[PDB]
Design a protein around this ligand. Structure first.
Ligand SMILES: CC(=O)N[C@H]1[C@@H](OP(=O)(O)OP(=O)(O)OC[C@H]2O[C@@H](n3ccc(=O)[nH]c3=O)[C@H](O)[C@@H]2O)O[C@H](CO)[C@@H](O)[C@@H]1O
Length: 331
């Protein structure tokens, strides 16, 4: 029958859901999506060929519930899977009111306010990171099959310039856009890596000028759809510690320098704890300090191979199947 997937806002909620949508489709189920206007599901969900049902101070919360109650009443789904955003709260409750089974998924290291409110009413609570829910099943984060790379995906580092990928993420954090050109100018041009910077949608034009003025050289973009290609090119990542970028770095088996209820700092810790990632706090690390940290791994790239070997082992390839298996066991 029909399946309802509720997710929106940023890529961290929309992308694990698009991967779940592909899995339900291969099993012979009709997937329908639950979103809100303005969010990024309006860009991605219609492109995937999937039906987008849109939802819109307590009287405002009830308006969202009526619309969600209607969408569920019309689709009579076998299961409803929530993944994050404003949508899951009124959507997940609507699912219970109509006696339709509900499964929730938490991408982050600390559970979200909606996921904490919805967990007691869900049949299965799927978690990405361990210890996030005090109880439930640890599936990991559902990552796009294409983002899974082996240690043969890239050329040896020895006698080659390192490729540096700077990630936004989904909206394109600002800071990083400022810190990177200033920091990269202090790194000798003999060791300076090749740069691909994913700035914001409104910050791509300005981040280009920032690199241009300090005389660096980078391929600055607002957003990259060709992510499997972006990860294969990269030897090192300097990123934001959003749930999916963290889980994708493991699938891609990539060393990272992460700049993160302190959800991101905890997300970064799961890489850091094993030696897969390196924690660089925003409030502390200046342009001089990032340059010095980069300089040591460029001078000694064998460091990147150990970080990559550890990252590859933290990947959870069955994250998508087990989330969908948890939905279809209760459906
Ligand atoms: C600033 C902010 O509020 N960030 C939050 C946001 O992160 P956000 O969703 O922005 O970042 P995440 O790392 O969670 O997810 C990024 C997703 O967007 C994709 N991507 C991004 C850029 C691009 O060029 N192409 C592309 O496909 C990534 O491959 C990945 O699939 O949502 C999450 C909520 O669950 C949290 O972890 C973050 O703290």
């Amino acid at each position: 029958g029909n399946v309802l997937i509720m997710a929106g806002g940023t890529g961290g909620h929309v992308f694990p859901a698009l991967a779940c949508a592909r899995e339900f489709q291969a099993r012979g189920y009709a997937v329908h999506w639950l979103g809100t206007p303005r969010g990024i599901e309006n860009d991605l969900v219609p492109k995937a060929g999937l039906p987008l049902h849109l939802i819109q101070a307590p009287l405002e919360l009830l308006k969202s519930l009526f619309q969600a109650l209607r969408v569920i009443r019309q689709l009579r789904p076998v299961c409803v899977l929530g993944l994050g955003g404003y949508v899951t709260g009124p959507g997940g409750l609507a699912a219970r009111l109509n006696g339709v089974p509900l499964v929730i998924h938490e991408q982050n290291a600390v559970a979200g306010t909606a996921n904490r409110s919805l967990a007691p009413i869900a049949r299965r609570v799927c978690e990405a990171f361990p210890d996030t829910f005090p109880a439930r099943l640890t599936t990991g984060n559902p990552v796009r099959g294409e983002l899974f790379l082996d240690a043969h995906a890239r050329a040896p580092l020895t006698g080659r310039r390192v490729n540096l990928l700077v990630l936004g993420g989904s909206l394109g954090a600002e800071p990083l856009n400022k810190l990177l050109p200033e920091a990269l100018a202090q790194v000798p041009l003999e060791i300076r890596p090749a740069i691909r910077h994913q700035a914001g949608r409104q910050h791509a034009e300005i981040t280009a000028e920032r690199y241009r003025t300090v005389a660096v050289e980078a391929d600055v973009a607002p957003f990259i759809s060709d992510m499997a290609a972006a990860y294969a090119w990269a030897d090192l990542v300097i990123c934001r510690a959003g749930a999916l970028t963290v889980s994708e770095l493991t699938a891609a088996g990539l060393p990272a320098f992460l700049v993160p209820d302190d959800h991101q700092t905890r997300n970064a810790e799961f890489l850091v704890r094993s030696g897969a990632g390196r924690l660089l706090p925003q409030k502390s690390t200046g342009a001089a300090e990032l340059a010095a940290q980069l300089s040591e791994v460029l001078m000694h790239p064998e460091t990147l191979r150990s970080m990559a070997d550890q990252a590859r082992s933290l990947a959870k390839p069955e994250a998508t199947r087990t989330v969908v298996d948890a939905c279809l066991e209760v459906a």
